[model samples]
Target: DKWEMERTDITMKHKLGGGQYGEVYEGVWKKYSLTVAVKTLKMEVEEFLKEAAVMKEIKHPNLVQLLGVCTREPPFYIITEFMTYGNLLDYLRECNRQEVNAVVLLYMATQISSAMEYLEKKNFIHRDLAARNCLVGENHLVKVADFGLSRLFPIKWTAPESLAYNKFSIKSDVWAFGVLLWEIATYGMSPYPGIDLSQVYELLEKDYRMERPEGCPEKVYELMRACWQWNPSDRPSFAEIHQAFETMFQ
Candidate 1:
């Protein structure tokens, strides 16, 4: 139902960000003066509605809040809480301060892992869990964003031939988290860049795990290494990760 709007002006600010869909804009919710990040779709696709429903179902502090959606027109628009720091990749890079200490790093990791842990409990798989998808908020608050490729895990499902062919699974999400840890350490570099996607797959098949970059603390590296385990079952669960991060700083 499209309602006629009264006189109100929404100032859409162009921001420097990119996603699988396209460029994202930072805008303000005019009525309430709330900041919002708008993801505009190229065409009216069902994925936006699918994601809207999923967002409505899931709730977590580390997950971005979905404001009411706009589907009254041809082009679909998704409005979410504006993450002031942009994505985690740029957050880590431009905010580099070596002497700021590893405590802050551990805090950031725990927040994200805890978010993933919450999603796991709900049987949802975040297919992509990288730095670029993580949004950092004030006072070290971290929220995982982007669910375009997320899937719900079946109770008793065997590895599909396609997944087996690529070694992808919820476990793969864990591996991606390990790469995120590396991002935290190295200020966010593309995971295994300069190598083709096939080469990355081959490396994973060969059990070549990601390592912490220089200057990253030992305790943090160990936790990341545990997450990088080739065997999915062998990886430490999120609860374990939470406890590990707590113990590291203690």
Candidate 2:
């Protein structure tokens, strides 16, 4: 497809970051003089191709744009628009509380929900939805990224049913979105502080949920709580979540 780009056209600069599956580098397209983030996969080529396929099919402002792919050889590469501000977690950490108010936080949440709504309509589940997986661009624009784990679910952000049965769906994604809300509210704190991973399930079984972050609006916290509902059907759809934010902004 046209999504494929020649390896010779790219010039890798420095390592931007890395994950279990791969390392991301800051690179440039020599011909276009365009900055890019190149994600080099260390996983099986099949997984890399699978991620590229998903990336190729989806496009939205709030979703990181896949520029192209370099898969003519092993160690496949995924080229995406370079997010200047980097990951959301670190971005939030650097911003002073006064600089990012409740409204700003809500805007970020709304953008993410809007993107998720699109994916939901397309019948795609972003199994890993969290602040750390989100990228921040100019003017605090947040774009969802890191699909390397989209087909996988982390315990902290995963729904109860998903954890127990290894089932992932839009509902499970909603559950993760709730955790993402918590992340934004707390300005990027790790979810479930002081709790062991092994205890998450048993605790959730007892209907235990994270308390609202200090200074967070009750409405926002309530939305997060709704996403953490025990039953998948009980969670709000991404469309509903987006609409709720719309109403709040109004």
Candidate 3:
């Protein structure tokens, strides 16, 4: 509805970063002195709007909020709420020197699962789920951010079927979410840290799952293993994961 706005109203600043299609900026909306993460893209124009349109109707506390979009012109822009601390990956990595505890780490993971639970109920698949794709909001809260375009994914973060056949579903998203959990538990260590990308699929075919990160709780590791199950149907649903996490906090 009102999400579509004039491009001139936004003053896009320094490049934050982006995907194969484009980049994002820490931009300001002239009207409200509103700071936003403005994503400017190169394509796939209709696909961009498809994302924007879906984003408009969906609002969950843990999902990054889509604020406005500039779709009338060639280089399209989509604006979202500015996350003060930036992406979750950096936050987790930076915390190695700080004092973030297991309780807080579990809370962070739980928040993302709650968001995924919402998306799953809405019949939407994130396609991409990772520490790098989530934002760190105030009070160290985490919000799931961004969607994935097929044919471009980090192999280590992808499920074998999705990687081989580009067959993505909520279940595939579940698999990715499991990998994200590992990052949270390990404080931002990349999945398959030293493994070559070429060997990942073959390794998965052999039922190779990552070992538990040091000091990760036994039950948490159990959930991670559940998501990496060979059959997609065998993967845990976001609802189930969220429920399990609720128990973890007890």
Candidate 4:
């Protein structure tokens, strides 16, 4: 169904799956045969604008392409590449356990690590890097999504006392990635099942980390532990992480 005439000369057909934000529809550029994921925001958000700016500025294979935006109405629409495979977490959940191989996990980790490295290079902290925010593309390529909570970390700046004493940095994303790894290994088991976020945080503060289940490789467990370290400074960089996993597979 056509909504209204636009300057871009595009026509959109509503599909499904649009929450609090505006509805997502199948759209065509008219000039090009490209399919796009259109997210029309319900309200104007400065944070959303910042996120859009950051994404537009960053160019990496692991990052999704931000095609364009429409700001004519109260709800702005953001157009980007349409990822056929929903979020990684959902895809992993639907994966057949017996068919999942070590190579697949290695490639997934590498892709995410590469995205994290890119963000780090740009001095941006993807504070919420989790499986739910990762999108799978062709050739099993993974792209990180959801920049609503992303922050730009400035060098020489101290941690903001109010932000849970958390400084937006690679370490924060590393910790989240560790949880994502556990999720992948467990086929999407809820982290600390039956426990609340408060309890999880308390446990984390006490240096408690996730324990890998049976059959998981020892080296992978070690890397995940490094990511879950209480002290951010102790976390390994993406470059170091790539080497660790690459060595494990070798």
Candidate 5:
């Protein structure tokens, strides 16, 4: 019962949306008088128990903390700290575009990159990079989280070698981070807009790269291109990429 949450003390509110795990909700933990995000699980408790064991091992300010679980009864649930602004993608798309200038966008990237930097230090490799991989809250506090060990392979964000040889490494994660930067640059637009996932590996092998999205700074796109270097070793380290953003503030 280390991370157990009592069912009677919680009340489910509105649906946040469906994730790789299951439908999520904006919930209230009455016992604590706190709002939280909750995900209902359809799988066995041991599955997430194994995953949660690993989550409990790592803690970072920019990472969404795994709060607790309600597996004592059916309709099992997993809870996490509530992010006021919901997922990062929707915030970018729905927020007043005029309010989100280049510096604001860079700040959002900076927070997620900071989290990636910490993960890199811990020798952790995140193979996923989608709009929903992180959430934004007040002050643009972005928290990254993996739904579970579901291997939700991100085709568009994947690197060439990963696609070709089934390889996943810290370098590949850097490449996906670049794609995510492009997504942020385009205000949550999907990367490789006209290309299909099946063709990404071939196109990447052919040296095909997406052009800078309209209005993206030359320097910002430069960083994204650096991450897309064909050879994994040629890609810049997460440490370098994030710090570069920190210094590029102008």
Candidate 6:
């Protein structure tokens, strides 16, 4: 496919970020003079490439774009568009609360939901949806990233059913979206301030949800509560969530 790029074509630059399987670097495509983020995994090249195929299939303004892959050599790489502003969590933390107005926050949330809705329609579940996994770019645009962790759900953002039975579905992604909303509302504060990770399941069973972030709009808080519903079927679809935000702005 045209999506395959020769390693010789890319000039790997400084490290941008990384994870358990690999390191991501800021790279340059000589042929097109494009700046990119190249993800190189040290192991499981086959699995990583399979995931890369999935990433290539996903196209949305709110999702990071997978540009190409380098699979002819070891240390396989998956290249994507480089986001200059970096991760959403750090961006939110750096900005003054007053500077990030409700409209801007709502825009970020709606963008994420739109991306999730697209993925939901494609029959994919983003098991890891969090502020840290999202990128902010020019014009305050937010794009969801880090699809490599689709199988590794984080404790705080994971849904109860996923924790109890390793079941990841669209509803589980909605649960994580709720936590991500809390992250944005709190300007990147940790989701559960006082509780330990081990206590999460027990607390959820007791109907204990996180307190609404201070200064978060009542309607937004209501949506978060809706996402945290105990029953997976009770959670709203990403389409419904997107519509809710649309209705809010209208």
Number of the top lDDT candidate = 6
Would you estimate the TM-scores of all the predictions?
0.82, 0.95, 0.92, 0.85, 0.90, 0.94
Error of 4 at 96 (Å): 2.9
Q: For model 4, how many clashes?
A: 0
Q: What lDDT is reached at residue 16 by model 5? A: 78
**Descending-TM-score candidate ranking:** 2, 6, 3, 5, 4, 1
**lDDT, candidates in the order shown:** 0.68, 0.87, 0.85, 0.68, 0.81, 0.88
After superposition on all CA atoms, how large is the RMSD of candidate 3? 2.6
Report the candidate with higher TM-score, 4 versus 6: 6
Per-residue lDDT over 1-250 for candidate 4, one digit per residue giving the tens place of the 0 to 100 score? 1223253655676663444223666677675777777765673477666666666676788887777776555466667787777678777888765555667877888888887777777777775567777888766778887554454622111122213665467777777777777777776676776765545555665666667866678888888888876677888887788677777666
User: Could you give candidate 1's per-residue lDDT for residues 1-250 as a string of tens digits?
Assistant: 2322222323467754655426567778787887777766654477777776677666788988777566655445667788776778788877857532477778888888888888777777776677878888887788999554455521011122224555455666676677788888787766665665545545666766666688888877887777777568887877677777777767
Candidate 1: how many backbone clashes? Answer: 0
How well does model 3 score by local distance difference test?
0.85
lDDT of 6 at 52: 84
Q: On a 0 to 100 scale, what is the lDDT of residue 18 in model 6?
A: 50
Name the TM-score of candidate 6: 0.94
Candidate 2 global CA lDDT score:
0.87
List model 2 lDDT by residue over 1-250, tens digit each. 8998888788988888554224888999887899998988654788878888889888888999999998888667899999998888887888977878888898899999999998888878886788888998877799999464353258899899988988888898899999999999988999999899989999999999999899989999999999999989989999999999999985
